[PDB]
């Protein structure tokens, strides 16, 4: 069987140029260095090294191609990477946010049947523009959903503003690939943070912004009232598998709740949104995540991902194999076995299935 | 028929109340004329609501109830008597001493402590304590402390939080501590408190009760201070450290293959010499210096637990008596202490020696119960 990356980046030309542009984080400039996350601003007035280095790794499309040669993967549904669109003034997000969606279908045309791809959306625009938006990419060659960040339109997930643009991407059966960026306010990591290098902003904040968001949505009723959307959720759903039921008892324990009636006796759990309306990628590192993600939304709801190109091997050969990506695949033998159904699904099928690329 | 053991369950001493009733800034007790019954408020998440009550009275009330059980030893032994527990081994509540003045701390922190000790010798064989230390004070006050607990019947162990001596847990003035807990060999037991800053959950966040705080702020709280003790060596620093983690780690049995893959992609890190060959990993330190709880409220989390520190190493516990059913004239056994119980039964199965030692024989053997 076919086996689908659905986390996996590219920042194109275009956007590149912005970053360079940039004098605030996000930005990006020579010592490339990328510059994305608001831990990394320390290290920049320091440096004015910091960040991330800018490699070819981002920007060229034969380098995505090699990489799924060498990694044994057959197709990947590309996306934009943090922070897209964001920091943009409102009047020229829209007509950024075409010309890159532009880019990413005329690259996915020149591997066909290899290359998909997640639009990202003017979200610092107005709605009425970012409906606008969202009928204009459903209509592109490859593209197979949205990607969107944590903010919403700046307020979250739980924006009331927000609601049309969630109800728009439903109708327009588009998956929407919530991901991760401002983590958490880096003052939680300590005074020593600087000393773990990027471990805690990346292993901590990432999933647990992303598990933040997603119960905001679930409490402010968002996946009730847009009974057909569809999310998601980068790096197997934060943390949400693993507290899905410290969510649940301290719901139905919330004296306040209960008593103002908002508990009622057939809401839908979480762990019920879980199964019917959540999706989990797998990048998560381990059977052991991967076993508790698996029993929160099914197996046939778990899409392998790679997280390209964020995790380059240090010291092996950045053209050869990466273990950023074979963790993950192991991941997936040791929770459901070599050759198994399951693991067919969670390796691609079920990304074939639900993306529509069979 | 297997001994069942509590680890995690809660008292405030009388005294301790009153401290709070006198105190003017959380946390704080605090009695409005809408109730009868006096407010417990404890959190920064609380603050706001706080502020509404005090300026108008028809705003709810704030924090949550300080029912009677949290002072009532005969309410905690009715408690395990009417939910299948035969031991608990009962802690000061957080905040802990966190907030007194630091002159003060010690005397009221050995006065709290020899009160817990004298709480469990009411019922010889039933009730063992944690202690907490005036951490607030300096660290050799902090040690002296150590000292008298160590002398005291019942103790087991010692309860804190993730703020140590007020830089976290990777402060290096904290080493002592971590040193004198460990060699005299009383588990530690972190627990939450702090949470995450408000402005994470939102401008609709007095929307959605104590949800986001209690069910997300403490256990990510949880992880990032044992992730920092992680990353400054700690657990190296101090071989014979053994830590029990509140709510099965917070996160970090999900969370731990995430961490592992963070450090060894690590340019600087690897670079600088910090991820040598020789490294001891999470995984290996979650199997040989970490205890978890089990209140994980579902299979799934517990499974996860499981796979990460191993049966031997997971413990039940109820967090009595923070989470009393909402609904009046209810009998029997706390659905919140229910939903734990029956998470061990779906994960290991009813009557297994992985049940039995989950639900009290780890905790017998480790805390030596007798
Ligand atoms: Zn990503
Ligand atoms: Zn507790």
Request: charged share 20%; aromatic share 8%.
């Given at each position: 069987?076919v086996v689908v990356d659905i986390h996996t980046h590219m920042?194109?030309?275009?956007?590149?140029?912005?970053?360079?542009?940039?004098?605030?984080?996000?930005?990006?400039?020579?010592?490339?260095?990328?510059?994305?996350?608001?831990?990394?601003?320390?290290?920049?007035?320091?440096?004015?090294?910091?960040?991330?280095?800018?490699?070819?790794?981002?920007?060229?499309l034969?380098?995505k191609m090699?990489?799924m040669?060498?990694?044994?993967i057959r197709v990947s549904v590309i996306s934009l990477?943090?922070?897209?669109?964001?920091?943009?003034?409102?009047?020229?997000?829209?007509?950024?946010?075409?010309?890159?969606n532009?880019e990413f279908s005329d690259m996915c045309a020149q591997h066909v049947g290899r290359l998909f791809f997640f639009a990202?959306?003017?979200?610092?625009?107005?709605?009425?523009?970012?409906?606008?938006?969202?009928?204009?990419v459903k209509?592109l060659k490859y593209c197979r959903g949205i990607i969107?960040?944590?903010?919403?339109?700046?307020?979250?997930?739980?924006?009331?503003?927000?609601?049309?643009?969630?109800?728009?991407?439903?109708?327009?059966?588009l998956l929407?690939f919530?991901?991760?960026?401002?983590?958490?306010?880096?003052?939680?990591?300590?005074?020593?943070?600087?000393?773990?290098?990027?471990?805690?902003?990346?292993?901590?904040?990432?999933?647990?912004?992303?598990?933040?968001?997603?119960?905001?949505?679930?409490?402010?009723?968002?996946?009730?009232?847009?009974?057909?959307?569809?999310?998601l959720?980068?790096?197997?759903?934060?943390?949400?598998?693993?507290?899905?039921?410290?969510?649940?008892?301290?719901?139905?324990?919330?004296?306040?709740?209960?008593?103002?009636?908002?508990?009622?006796?057939?809401?839908?759990?979480?762990?019920?949104?879980?199964?019917?309306?959540?999706?989990?990628?797998?990048?998560?590192?381990?059977?052991?995540?991967?076993?508790?993600?698996?029993?929160?939304?099914?197996?046939?709801?778990?899409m392998?991902g790679?997280?390209?190109?964020?995790?380059?091997?240090?010291?092996?050969?950045?053209?050869?194999?990466?273990?950023?990506?074979?963790?993950?695949?192991?991941?997936?033998?040791?929770?459901?076995?070599?050759?198994?159904?399951?693991?067919?699904?969670?390796?691609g099928?079920?990304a074939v299935r639900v993306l529509s690329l069979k």
């Open positions: 069987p920042y194109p030309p275009s956007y590149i140029a912005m970053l360079e542009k940039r004098q605030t984080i996000p930005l990006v400039r020579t010592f490339p260095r990328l510059i994305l996350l608001s831990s990394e601003l320390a290290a920049l007035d320091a440096a004015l090294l910091p960040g991330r280095p800018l490699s070819t790794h981002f920007a060229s034969a380098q090699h990489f040669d060498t990694n044994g990477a943090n922070p897209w669109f964001d920091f943009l003034a409102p009047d020229e997000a829209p007509g950024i946010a075409d010309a890159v532009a990202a959306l003017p979200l610092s625009a107005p709605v009425d523009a970012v409906k606008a938006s969202i009928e204009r209509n969107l960040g944590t903010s919403g339109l700046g307020k979250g997930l739980d924006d009331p503003h927000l609601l049309p643009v969630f109800e728009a991407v439903a109708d327009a059966k929407v919530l991901h991760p960026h401002y983590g958490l306010p880096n003052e939680v990591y300590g005074p020593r943070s600087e000393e773990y290098g990027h471990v805690l902003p990346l292993a901590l904040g990432f999933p647990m912004e992303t598990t933040i968001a997603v119960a905001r949505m679930y409490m402010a009723g968002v996946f009730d009232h847009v009974r057909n959307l569809q999310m959720l980068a790096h197997s759903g934060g943390t949400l598998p693993f507290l899905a039921g410290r969510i649940e008892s301290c719901i139905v324990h919330d004296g306040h709740l209960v008593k103002t009636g908002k508990v009622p006796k057939d809401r839908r759990t979480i762990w019920t949104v879980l199964k019917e309306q959540i999706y989990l990628d797998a990048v998560i590192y381990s059977e052991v995540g991967l076993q508790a993600a698996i029993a929160s939304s099914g197996a046939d709801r778990l392998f790679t997280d390209h190109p964020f995790f380059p091997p240090i010291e092996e050969d950045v053209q050869g194999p990466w273990d950023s990506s074979r963790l993950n695949a192991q991941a997936v033998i040791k929770a459901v076995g070599e050759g198994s159904s399951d693991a067919a699904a969670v390796m099928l079920n």
